Design a protein around this ligand. Structure first.
Ligand SMILES: *[C@@H]1O[C@H](CO[C@@H]2O[C@@H](C)[C@@H](O)[C@@H](O)[C@@H]2O)[C@@H](O)[C@H](O)[C@H]1NC(C)=O
Ligand SMILES: *[C@H]1O[C@H](CO)[C@@H](O)[C@H](O)[C@@H]1O
Ligand SMILES: *[C@H]1O[C@H](CO)[C@@H](O)[C@H](O)[C@@H]1O
Ligand SMILES: [Ca+2]
Ligand SMILES: [Ca+2]
Ligand SMILES: [Ca+2]
Ligand SMILES: [Ca+2]
Ligand SMILES: [Ca+2]
Ligand SMILES: [Ca+2]
Length: 315
């Protein structure tokens, strides 16, 4: 019947539509025919003047309150005019305004990702919300430039955007334990409104590193008269991993001969190797020990060292 429109959040007293003019009532006709609104509920947001005959906004209207996420917001009101008693249907469309900014559940987020995460891995992200309708809702996401992660936004059945991180490079806790990203949600308004979420990616430690000796090959020389308990040398292996993954225990190689095992002995903790038995040039001029540092992780890693022992002559 009658169709008018008014912009959301417009200040009260804002003209909506000249009902009297569109109905043919002039001056006295407004009082004589008693120009009214349907009920008390009708005049909650609107007001119809007996003087001007103009329908205007009574209370500040929020489209997010009335229609929520509906595409079209139609507010029906009845205009009653007597002599003859006739009712008129008036449909006032509340035009959406871009007054809402994209919002996140939390301003800062922490994400814990395993160091062994293979590239191509996808991690979902908390989407942003924007109660506006049409293009005035969330339009796109942007991820701050970084070296390991990428942004992938997928369109859903609801028409809602679903953002997710994509791993581009192998993470390494031993270089940087933390990454910081800025996820920005932007709507499609002019000017565009936006909201941010700060993501802190914590790289969880994985036993991906094996112990390493200070020297891959070591060569020492000891006199033939060296008594038992004499300090040959102390091993120095290091592990960059965290916790039990970074602690190690020294031991001989699996293929180590019993002669060496009886001659030398190593402390699995300090890595100090001491000579237990007697040494002579007659027996053997050269001994080659295979040192091994085993990781206290899971799975266990291990590093290998080679010690070269040269024995002096008798008499
Ligand atoms: C024990 O070794 C530490 C690490 O040295 C470094 O790591 C080893 C595995 C090799 O890659 C080597 O080239 C590096 O320099 C030393 O920082 C530390 O001083 C050493 N402790 C000693 C000598 O008492
Ligand atoms: C989100 O984006 C809008 C438009 O790009 C900016 O105006 C705002 O400051 C925030 O960075
Ligand atoms: C994105 O930027 C906003 C300011 O616009 C911060 O409040 C937020 O914590 C995030 O860093
Ligand atoms: Ca609003
Ligand atoms: Ca709105
Ligand atoms: Ca908006
Ligand atoms: Ca690593
Ligand atoms: Ca590691
Ligand atoms: Ca390790």
């Amino acid at each position: 019947q009658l169709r008018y429109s008014v912009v959301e959040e417009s200040e009260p007293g804002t003209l909506v539509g000249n009902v009297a003019q569109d109905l043919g009532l002039k001056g006295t006709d407004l009082l004589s025919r008693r120009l009214r609104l349907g009920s008390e509920e009708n005049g909650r947001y609107f007001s119809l003047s007996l003087v001007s005959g103009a329908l205007a906004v009574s209370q500040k209207i929020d489209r997010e309150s009335l229609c929520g996420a509906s595409t079209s917001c139609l507010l029906p009101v009845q205009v009653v005019t007597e002599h003859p008693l006739e009712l008129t249907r008036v449909e006032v469309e509340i035009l959406d305004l871009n007054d809402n900014s994209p919002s996140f559940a939390t301003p800062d987020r922490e994400m814990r990702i395993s160091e062994s995460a293979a590239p191509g891995a996808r991690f979902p992200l908390d989407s942003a919300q924007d109660p506006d309708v049409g293009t005035n809702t969330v339009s796109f996401y942007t991820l701050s430039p970084n070296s390991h992660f990428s942004l992938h936004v997928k369109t859903l059945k609801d028409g809602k955007l679903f953002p997710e991180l994509v791993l581009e490079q192998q993470l390494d806790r031993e270089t940087q334990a933390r990454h910081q990203l800025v996820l920005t949600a932007v709507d499609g308004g002019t000017p565009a409104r936006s909201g941010t979420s700060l993501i802190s990616v914590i790289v969880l430690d994985v036993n991906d590193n094996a112990p390493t000796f200070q020297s891959s090959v070591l060569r020492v020389g000891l006199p033939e008269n060296t008594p038992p308990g004499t300090l040959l040398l102390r091993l120095n292996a290091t592990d960059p991993d965290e916790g039990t993954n970074g602690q190690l225990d020294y031991s001989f190689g699996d293929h180590t001969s019993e002669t060496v095992k009886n001659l030398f002995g190593l402390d699995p903790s300090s890595g100090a190797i001491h000579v237990l038995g007697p040494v002579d040039f007659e027996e053997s001029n050269f001994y080659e020990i295979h040192a091994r540092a085993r990781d206290q992780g899971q799975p266990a890693m291990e590093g290998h060292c080679v010690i070269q022992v040269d024995v002096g002559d008798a008499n």
